[PDB]
Amino acid sequence: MKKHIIIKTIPKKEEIISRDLCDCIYYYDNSVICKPIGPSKVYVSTSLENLEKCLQLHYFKKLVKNIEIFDEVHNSKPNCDKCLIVEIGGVYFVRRVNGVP
């Protein structure tokens, strides 16, 4: 299942990391999307397993500090309350709280 992942990178390398991660993941998932999204942050949409196959290569291990996994992305303010909403670019990432009816 696709997730909406924010990767924290070292400073100044967002654009190259986005480009190179998309060229690595394409083999596993021809539908991947990547973009640089803020200072020290890259967006990727793919399954977590496909991301990790690439993030464990030597080249990416050096450049990536952490990741944050979200369930949804919206271009307008989301309407949920029982959730975490993070705005990066002018894009809204949502992580839902489990067990809400």
Numbering used by the authors: 1 to 101
Please quote the authors directly:
Recently, genomic evidence has implicated a critical role for disulfide bonds in the structural stabilization of intracellular proteins from certain of these organisms, contrary to the conventional view that structural disulfide bonds are exclusively extracellular. Considering the apparent abundance of disulfide bonding in P. aerophilum, proteins containing multiple cysteines in their amino acid sequences would be expected to have a high likelihood of containing disulfide bonds. To test this, a 98-residue protein containing six cysteine residues was selected from the P. aerophilum genome for structural characterization. The protein (GI 18312142) could not be assigned a function or three-dimensional fold in advance, as it had no recognizable sequence similarity to proteins of known function or structure.
The crystal structure of the protein was determined to a resolution of 1.6 Å with an R-factor of 18.4%. The first 70 amino acid residues constitute an N-terminal domain whose three-dimensional fold has been observed previously in the copper chaperone Atx1, but which does not contain the active-site residues of Atx1. The remaining 18 residues form a small C-terminal domain of novel fold that interacts with the N-terminal domain exclusively through hydrophobic contacts. The three-dimensional structure reveals that the six cysteine residues in the primary sequence are paired to form three disulfide bonds in the native fold (C22–C34, C24–C54, and C80–C83). Although one disulfide bond (C80–C83) fits the sequence of a potential metal-binding/active-site CxxC motif, the C22–C34 and C24–C54 disulfide bonds do not fit any known metal-binding or active-site motifs and appear to serve structural roles within the protein fold. Of the 16 P. aerophilum proteins whose structures have been determined to date, a total of 29 cysteine residues have been visualized, and 23 of these have been found to form disulfide bonds. Despite the still relatively small sample size, these numbers provide important three-dimensional structural support for the claim of abundant disulfide bonds in this organism, meriting a further survey of thermophilic protein structures. In every case where more than one cysteine is present within a P. aerophilum protein of known structure, a disulfide bond is found. As expected, Pyrobaculum aerophilum, an organism singled out in earlier studies, exhibits a high propensity for cysteines to be in close proximity, with pairs of cysteine residues appearing in proximity nearly ten times more often than expected by chance. Some organisms have evidently modulated their internal biochemistry to enable disulfide bonding as a key mechanism for stabilizing their proteins at high temperatures.
